[PDB]
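P.,

For your records, the input lines for the assembly:
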Amino acid sequence: STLCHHSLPALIEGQRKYYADYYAYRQEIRSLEGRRKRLQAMLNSSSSI
Amino acid sequence: MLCAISGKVPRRPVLSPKSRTIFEKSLLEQYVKDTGNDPITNEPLSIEEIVPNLLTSLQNEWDAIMLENFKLRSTLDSLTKKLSTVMYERDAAKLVAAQLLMEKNEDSKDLPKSSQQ
Amino acid sequence: MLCAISGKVPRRPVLSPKSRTIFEKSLLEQYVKDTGNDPITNEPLSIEEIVSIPNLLTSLQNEWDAIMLENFKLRSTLDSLTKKLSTVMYERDAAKLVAAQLLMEKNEDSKDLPKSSQ
Amino acid sequence: MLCAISGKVPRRPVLSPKSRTIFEKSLLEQYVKDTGNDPITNEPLSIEEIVESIPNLLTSLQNEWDAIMLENFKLRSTLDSLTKKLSTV
Amino acid sequence: MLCAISGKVPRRPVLSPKSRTIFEKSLLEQYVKDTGNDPITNEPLSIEEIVIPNLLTSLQNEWDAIMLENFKLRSTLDSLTKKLSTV
Amino acid sequence: IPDGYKNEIDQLVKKEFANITLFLEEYRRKYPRIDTSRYIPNESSEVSLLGIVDSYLKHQEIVLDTLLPQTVSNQWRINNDYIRQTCTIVEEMNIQQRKQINDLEIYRKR
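Structure tokens returned:
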């Protein structure tokens, strides 16, 4: 019983699920190029002035 | 309830002790007298060689109970998993606003203090 | 050690050769007859492919109580997720519109500073 | 149609070659494991020798076990009585 | 609980999909590297190839045992009955 | 701010939201079906004989034959060992998930 409850909270109810959060962070890798690319073009116009 | 030679309903179901398959006494006897062999397996055979549900129902209904619990659990985890990716990404996207808000606020004070002078 | 269907401790465990997972024979034999495919991976799989007093009254009563109130409460859990899986997606799309509205706001404020110099 | 041990309809019947008699695989194996013999003829036989509403349903199974327990009891006290309905003779 | 090859408690159990039996990964891996086969059945196997109910079954044991109890009384009745017909 | 900016942004998100089997399920209402409460009580003076023999003797004989000890604790401790093999396997997966979870966060950090 104790072991079962612990496993349920610990393996099924948490660590496997956190992987989804990691995937969400992973979309992240793609928002950064978009973040920088906007900043890079915004910098280019500032240089002209 | 069928013989394995002619395909009739056996009135006198005899079986061969080489390959377990219920024949009828007349047909198997005619096959032996033709050639001493079993008709299905072609093994040696002679004439002398020839010779609770309530619990089962309780199993059958349980078999469905397990099948139902599986499909119910799959959608549980698979759907709730989309809940986790949303909640993480939502508060993540929420931080975009907090950063965007303060920057938009900085532009206004900067431009208004400059446009003033 | 457990079955990958019912959540049992199998009496006659059998493993499928397409997807290495141990199922109790009666439960896997049922699934093949229903639809001939592995339940987990959805890959083609066949049957050949596999490799008195308290007991009547108190214990049996509790087993059908535990099954009844569990699946009913489990059906209640599934409804709540569908109830507001919707509150998640709506609040998400609501945030998307804020970001899109702020994205036009910020760069435009930042571009007005660049124009101010002139 | 009927296994000559329990009285059930066999779900995996097996026949003994020493004596022509279709048993059930589970019951015949138990008898051989006790003593290597056939239950009818007492001939030397081995294992290799063999050739292969709902809430009311709860109370029904309760009554059926309740009935079989008495049906087994009544059949043994009668056996014992005949022993002295024979020993007295 | 045990590894069929060595007879130890395997610390990394991997079940084969040709002959269903629990082998220790480190042991079976060497067996495959020797020759691509399963040790028991000698069937071909590669490294990639390696990877309420209890209460109801109890009631079968109850009835299955009681059915034999009836035979002990049915068979003895057939002998005591004929130790009576001839008497 | 784990107390200001989240509360601020939540209000802005809030404002954009201001803009936009039969037997089993019935038993769930909270009542288990009654079983045979007969065998235990009975009565010597009272009614029915079968209850005495069609309820108590044969079951007691089956009980005394069932109630056992021949194997004793050996059969119990053998199953206790199996439970320990089952438990350790779960915690090994807890580790494997723990490593890969921290490993993904590690890549994000850079």
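Two observations worth noting. Chain E touches chain C through twelve residues (CB under 8 Å). Chain E has three helices and two strands.

Regards
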